[PDB]
Design a protein around this ligand. Structure first.
Ligand SMILES: CCCCCCCC/C=C\CCCCCCCC(=O)OC[C@H](COP(=O)(O)OCCN)OC(=O)CCCCCCC/C=C\CCCCCCCC
Ligand SMILES: CCCCCCCC/C=C\CCCCCCCC(=O)OC[C@H](COP(=O)(O)OCCN)OC(=O)CCCCCCC/C=C\CCCCCCCC
Ligand code: HEC
Ligand code: HEM
Ligand code: HEM
Ligand code: HEM
Ligand SMILES: C[C@@]1(c2ccc(Oc3ccccc3)cc2)OC(=O)N(Nc2ccccc2)C1=O
Ligand SMILES: CCCCCCCCO[C@@H]1O[C@H](CO)[C@@H](O)[C@H](O)[C@H]1O
Ligand SMILES: CCCCCCCCO[C@@H]1O[C@H](CO)[C@@H](O)[C@H](O)[C@H]1O
Ligand SMILES: CCCCCCCCO[C@@H]1O[C@H](CO)[C@@H](O)[C@H](O)[C@H]1O
Ligand SMILES: CCCCCCCCO[C@@H]1O[C@H](CO)[C@@H](O)[C@H](O)[C@H]1O
Ligand code: FES
Lengths: 59, 67, 78, 49, 241, 49, 101, 379, 55, 54
């Protein structure tokens, strides 16, 4: 009954619906960025400065 | 010593039918143009047909051997 | 402000359901796609033709231009 | 006369849970709305992002 | 007359829509620019700081900059003086003005290379083909003195003598310095020099595609949802009769 | 431009009455081997090669 | 020879307004002359035209057409407005001619 | 009044144009480009301001200030891509908007149409002066070709050109004034858009069937607000895909080279959205004649409403016109293609053909076929 | 942020020009709103009493 | 005008010194700003005095 539970607690009152969108965005962003960055770096393993750096890092 | 894969591959590609035929037509042009003393002709076209076929071939293999 | 003075209408009944009582994209296979095909079909021989022709004129004109760049062996025979 | 008027049949369109005329439609209302609003709330999140 | 040979398409590791640049290759390419091309080619739009976190570390970048002497001033006497480079400095110009440049290249002007791959049809494919494609003129074609035959250059007679050959330098990373290897690297470097944002642009594009797929779907539903009212709507004409 | 003596002749040989801008090659110069012009195409302004 | 009938029947079918249940007259652009004529139509003919049009717009929005059995047939198409419209234009021309006179 | 949405003098306006506005129930995707054009306008202005805040209108600094923007300004490169490509998106949408208009006879709304043409003309001038700003080789020479078009006008021609230039050739005063014009014009476009929509509301929208929709209207919200937002995201994908994965697909590499007054590029070719017109300009081997053909190629749009002979508004039920319509569209593709090629056989002849047929379809075939179709309906 | 740097400098100048170019038009637009609200009632007058009897 | 610290001051000078009537246009703009404030102040004054603010 998630759809049902979600409706009552989150989607019914316009106020709660707004808070749900705010937190939802906050959560979504954190996850979407990380996943997106991961997918990108994975498709480019060994080509980024992130990958090469260790060779010349010598601080 | 040291060998540029570009040389290797270019020689291999020149063995190709298309290159061989193009090469052939070029040598023929070169020969006749070089033998005359009053002709406007030039062998750019045949050279291009050749270079075009050879290099197209090179493109596919060359980077496989480069770092 | 136009609603209310648009047209003189009589004896027409209409029935509708809340958007929550129905499906958003119903009968995709039994109705949607069959109609997309209908629509496509009824227009392809109206649209496609001139574009096909444009494509040809393009192919020709392009090939002809490049053909005229080639050497004419009959210019150096003698 | 209006007595001879009846609402057509919308079975080719009704959501599965309100297809049966002898079942309360209220029991599936929250789900039917929860879902539609979920889409909307999600679109709002993607948009805010 | 207008006979031209167009370069083939090489499978650069940065050609794919989600393909970043090979930074090892960009680092090397830089050395080629620094040790070979910069002798006659300027790169006005890139500074030593641009290297940091891309191809070099900050320490390295600073070193590279200090290797150069730059003019500054005026000082207290209103005199111009020399000083060692700072990472905020842009790459040194080989000449004070194009006049001097031409003067040192037989009237020919070596172009700035900051945007060269974008200023030429074919981009790196063209720069690569030109660098490795020198050869003797075909029968019936004579190159005037000072120029060199290159089928890839328009007109085919370029004022640039073949800039690179095997082992013309030594990659400090041990990569076999072959002519084509060198061209391939410097070309990669040139791509970066022209669009430093290359990588970030592609990472954004990825997200753009995902968010777009998602959002387009949700909006499609919502439009369908609201319009269902009219789409399934029925009507009849019941005149009194 | 410095015109060879060969050139200066071919310009003396031009049907003027059959030209767009009816002008004799000696109405444009003060010294035959020296022709000075403003290299801008009188059409839409490009520079003539 | 009956060449028109051949052509006019082909066109009618090619046009396709009959797929929406519309008569030829239902599709006329409502300029001044047409607007006037419409006001002269008898109640029923008017209400009928309205339903056909509303119905067609509903079809147009739905992106459907009527089942082939409901398409109007070339020879059953009713030129319900043409007579009115002609009178309307005639009258107009009369006024026009007269106002120059 | 009981509810503010109607009494308030400002909301009243929003309500009557975007909430309670009566809209035909059956308008298609072809009616989505009006709002898309509006969004391009808002988008272009917003990105233009952001770019203008780092731009420098001076021949010695133009090119590099743009370079400075793309290389140093946070997301400067992104903002520039969005602006440059947005201009294309703007033309794609304006052309489809126009097509829809001609097809559905939306031009029978004469004032909405006419201002529509003014909007097009203004957008063209905007794009032109804007394109010149980066000051590359293409910016410079295009500016040279275009401005010299006006020199074709008899008597006052040379005088007008030198005036517009602020000197004897395209130079710094041309650049600085072009920047100002480029900054100003977009706002005239915004203003005239209001006039456009004002005339339009006098009658509300037309619809695909070309028959009165008074019997079936619906509130703009949420029907078309939702449909419009959907259309926005659909067109937004290609736009972003292009801008983010192929930033330079549409531009001439020649514009990555600082303008050189002494060297004209070998193949001067205009942006894609001007090709078909360029083609027409070249069809007539006579300076003035070619200019008139070009002028007429666009001003011909003011004539459309008077070449309507059909007794029906749209082409929906006019199969012969529909063919004639797609011929015209294809004719435009051919012109576009011809405009990107050099002036040489077979292009020259193909070009003059397409040019000649372009005007023939609009000035003769369309009114003629419309009359012919009327008779086949027995009218 | 407003400065675009650590002090009033070139990026301040170029952004100020753009603002200066833009704002006058916001002034023009808001003027329309000004006169729009005004016409809801028309002008007031020196005696501060209704002038409906003498317009 | 030219918005760049190295050219601002002189572009204005160029305007007043070289542009036909440039000096006049600059005076009208500079002084117009003042007339603008004189008028806005009196407009406000009138407003406060006559209760236009209601
Ligand atoms: C981490 C990031 C932090 C995010 C901070 C931003 C905070 C934003 C949250 C604001 C709260 C939003 C809630 C709105 C509530 C109003 C409402 O009813 O929903 C919107 C309402 C839905 O109605 P119902 O389905 O009937 O819902 C009734 C349920 N009781 O209308 C909508 O559908 C609007 C949502 C769709 C958004 C459309 C935008 C799509 C366009 C895409 C382009 C991309 C964006 C780029 C922006 C550029 C601008 C500079
Ligand atoms: C100007 C510069 C030119 C630049 C190049 C032009 C771009 C060419 C790309 C092609 C555009 C895609 C169009 C394909 C649409 C295919 C299609 O569906 O056509 C059939 C379809 C059938 O509709 P109905 O008659 O209402 O029937 C429905 C049920 N009874 O017709 C339509 O969609 C309506 C036509 C509107 C599209 C017009 C867009 C063409 C754009 C070019 C600019 C032309 C105008 C300039 C005139 C001067
Ligand atoms: C001795 C000076 C010199 C060196 C070293 C040199 N160049 Fe050049 N380069 C030139 C000159 C001179 C031209 C001008 C050619 C012309 O226009 O005739 C030129 C032109 C070019 C062009 C293309 C010009 C065009 O019109 O397409 C490119 C690209 C280029 N060089 C790349 C390189 C790269 C990369 C390197 C280093 C690997 C390099 N050059 C090294 C002298 C040099
Ligand atoms: C800056 C450019 C323009 C903008 C922002 C714009 C905007 C709009 C808007 C929002 C609409 C309503 C929705 C729609 O039907 O698309 C519209 C309708 C219309 N516009 Fe434009 N327009 C522009 C250019 C033009 C052009 C170039 C023409 C004609 C040459 C034109 C002709 C019309 C007409 C006739 C309609 C009527 C639509 C109908 O048939 O109902 N518009 N426009
Ligand atoms: C109708 C909307 C607009 C259109 C069609 C448009 C179009 C263009 C075009 C064609 C370019 C050249 C892009 C390139 O570099 O290749 C350009 C440049 C520019 N535009 Fe706009 N523009 C619009 C609105 C604006 C506005 C409102 C401003 C500023 C307030 C503006 C400021 C600029 C600036 C500063 C540039 C130079 C930087 C650059 O070239 O990227 N534009 N514009
Ligand atoms: C760009 C600035 C402004 C412009 C162009 C402007 C323009 C106008 C116009 C044309 C009128 C009608 C004629 C008149 O009574 O003077 C008016 C009236 C008025 N304005 Fe402004 N105004 C401006 C600024 C202001 C300011 C700063 C205030 C108040 C802080 C203001 C308050 C009013 C009011 C209340 C009236 C009512 C006059 C009456 O008592 O009948 N205006 N304004
Ligand atoms: C973007 C562009 C452009 C935009 C709109 C145009 O439409 C016109 C605007 C004003 C006057 C005439 C046409 C023309 C060119 O501006 C510009 O310099 N170019 N480039 C160009 C190149 C060669 C010849 C002619 C032009 C454009 O395409
Ligand atoms: C005080 C807060 C400081 C935050 C520093 C912001 C640094 C922005 O870092 C950004 O990260 C992106 C993802 O890796 C890269 O693609 C961008 O090029 C880079 O500039
Ligand atoms: C409908 C299209 C929505 C576009 C949303 C994509 C958001 C772009 O995301 C961007 O990615 C960059 C690369 O990691 C980051 O450096 C930026 O800070 C971030 O905003
Ligand atoms: C907020 C969106 C506005 C879009 C512009 C549409 C035009 O203009 C019209 O003027 C009338 C008198 O002032 C108003 O009553 C109408 O509502 C308004 O649309
Ligand atoms: C010509 C400028 C007139 C002032 C604008 C007032 C418009 C608002 O006025 C309303 O419509 C009444
Ligand atoms: S041929 Fe047209 S500008 Fe020279």
């Amino acid at each position: 009954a998630l759809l049902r539970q979600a409706y009552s607690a989150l989607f019914r009152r316009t106020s709660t619906f707004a808070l749900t969108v705010v937190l939802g965005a906050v959560l979504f962003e954190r996850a979407f960025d990380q996943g997106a960055d991961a997918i990108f770096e994975h498709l480019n393993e060994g080509k980024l400065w992130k990958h090469i750096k260790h060779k010349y890092e010598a601080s | 010593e040291l060998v540029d894969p570009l040389t290797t591959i270019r020689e291999h590609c020149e063995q190709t039918e298309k290159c061989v035929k193009a090469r052939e037509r070029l040598e023929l042009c070169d020969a006749r143009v070089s033998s005359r003393s009053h002709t406007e002709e030039q062998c750019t076209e045949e050279l291009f047909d050749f270079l075009h076929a050879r290099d197209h071939c090179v493109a596919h293999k060359l980077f496989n051997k480069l770092k | 402000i136009h609603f209310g003075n648009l047209a003189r209408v009589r004896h027409i009944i209409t029935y509708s359901l809340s958007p929550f009582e129905q499906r958003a994209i119903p009968n995709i296979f039994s109705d949607a796609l069959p109609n997309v095909w209908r629509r496509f079909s009824s227009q392809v021989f109206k649209v496609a033709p001139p574009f096909l022709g444009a494509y040809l004129l393009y192919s020709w004109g392009t090939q002809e231009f490049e053909r005229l760049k080639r050497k004419n062996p009959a210019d150096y025979e003698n | 006369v209006h007595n001879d008027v009846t609402v057509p049949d919308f079975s080719a369109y009704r959501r599965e849970d309100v297809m049966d005329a002898t079942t309360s439609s209220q029991t599936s209302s929250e789900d039917r709305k929860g879902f539609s609003y979920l889409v909307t709330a999600t679109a709002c999140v993607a948009t805010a992002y | 007359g207008e006979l031209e040979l167009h370069p083939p398409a090489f499978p650069w590791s940065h050609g794919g829509p989600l393909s970043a640049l090979d930074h090892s290759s960009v680092r090397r390419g830089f050395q080629v620019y620094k040790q070979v091309c910069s002798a006659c080619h300027s790169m006005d739009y890139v500074a030593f700081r641009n290297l940091i976190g891309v191809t070099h570390t900050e320490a390295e970048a600073k070193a590279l900059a200090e290797e150069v002497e730059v003019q500054d001033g005026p000082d207290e006497n209103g005199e111009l003086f020399m000083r060692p480079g700072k990472i905020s400095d842009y790459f040194p110009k080989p000449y004070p003005n194009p006049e001097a440049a031409r003067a040192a290249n037989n009237g020919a002007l070596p172009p700035d290379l900051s945007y060269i791959v974008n200023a030429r049809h074919g981009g790196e494919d063209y720069v690569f083909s030109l660098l490795t494609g020198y050869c003797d003129p075909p029968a019936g074609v004579v190159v005037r003195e000072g120029l060199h035959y290159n089928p890839y250059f328009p007109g085919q007679a370029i004022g640039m003598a073949p800039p690179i050959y095997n082992e013309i330098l030594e990659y400090d990373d041990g990569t076999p310095a072959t002519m084509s290897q060198i061209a391939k690297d410097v070309c990669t470097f040139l791509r970066w020099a022209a669009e430093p944002e290359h990588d970030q642009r592609k990472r954004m594009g990825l997200k753009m595609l995902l968010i777009s797929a998602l959002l387009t779907s949700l909006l499609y539903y919502m439009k369908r949802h609201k319009w269902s009212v009219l789409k399934s709507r029925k009507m009849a004409y019941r005149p009194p009769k | 431009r410095h015109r060879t003596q060969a050139e200066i002749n071919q310009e003396a040989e031009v049907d003027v009455s059959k030209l767009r801008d009816p002008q004799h090659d000696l109405d444009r110069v003060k010294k035959p081997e020296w022709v000075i012009l403003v290299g801008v195409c009188t059409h839409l302004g490009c520079v003539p090669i | 020879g009956r060449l028109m009938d051949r052509i006019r029947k082909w066109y009618y079918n090619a046009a396709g307004f009959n797929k929406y249940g519309l008569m030829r007259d239902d599709t006329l652009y409502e300029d001044d002359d047409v607007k006037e004529a419409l006001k002269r139509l008898p109640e029923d003919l008017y209400n009928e035209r309205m339903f056909r049009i509303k119905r067609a717009l509903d079809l147009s929005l739905k992106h459907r057409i009527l089942p082939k059995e409901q398409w109007v047939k070339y020879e059953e198409d009713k030129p319900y407005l043409e007579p009115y419209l002609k009178e309307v234009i005639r009258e107009r021309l009369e006024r026009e001619a007269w106002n120059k006179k | 009044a009981p509810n503010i949405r109607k009494s308030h003098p400002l909301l009243k306006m929003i309500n009557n144009s975007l909430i309670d506005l009566p809209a035909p129930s059956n308008i298609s995707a072809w009616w989505n480009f009006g709002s898309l054009l509006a969004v391009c306008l808002m988008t272009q202005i917003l990105t233009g301001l952001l770019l203008a805040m780092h731009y420098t209108a001076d021949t010695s600094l133009a090119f590099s200030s743009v370079a400075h923007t793309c290389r140093n300004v946070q997301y400067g490169w992104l903002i520039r891509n969005l602006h440059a490509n947005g201009a294309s998106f703007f033309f794609i949408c304006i052309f489809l908007h126009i097509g829809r208009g001609l097809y559905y006879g939306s031009y029978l709304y004469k004032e909405t149409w006419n201002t529509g043409v003014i909007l097009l003309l203004t957008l063209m001038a905007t794009a032109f002066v804007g394109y010149v700003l980066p000051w590359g080789q293409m910016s410079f020479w295009g500016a040279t070709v275009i401005t010299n078009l006006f020199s074709a006008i008899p008597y006052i021609g040379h005088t007008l050109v030198e005036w517009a230039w602020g000197g004897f050739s395209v130079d710094n005063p041309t650049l600085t004034r072009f920047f100002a014009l480029h900054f100003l014009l977009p706002f005239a476009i915004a203003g005239i858009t209001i006039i456009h929509l004002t005339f339009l509301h006098e009658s509300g929208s037309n619809n695909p069937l070309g028959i009165s929709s008074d019997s079936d209207k619906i509130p703009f919200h949420p029907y078309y607000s939702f449909k419009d937002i959907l259309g926005l995201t659909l067109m937004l994908t290609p736009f972003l895909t292009l801008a983010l994965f192929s930033p330079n697909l549409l531009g001439d590499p020649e514009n990555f080279t600082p303008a050189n007054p002494l060297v004209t590029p070998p193949h001067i070719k205009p942006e894609w959205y001007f090709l078909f017109a360029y083609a027409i300009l070249r069809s007539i081997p006579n300076k003035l004649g070619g200019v008139l053909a070009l002028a007429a190629s666009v001003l011909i749009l003011f004539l459309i409403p008077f070449l309507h002979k059909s007794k029906q508004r749209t082409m929906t039920f006019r199969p012969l016109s529909q063919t004639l319509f797609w011929l015209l569209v294809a004719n435009l593709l051919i012109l576009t293609w011809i405009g990107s090629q050099p002036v040489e056989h077979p292009f020259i002849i193909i070009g003059q053909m397409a040019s000649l047929s372009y005007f023939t379809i609009l000035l003769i075939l369309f009114p003629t076929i419309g009359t012919l179709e009327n008779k086949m309906l027995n009218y």
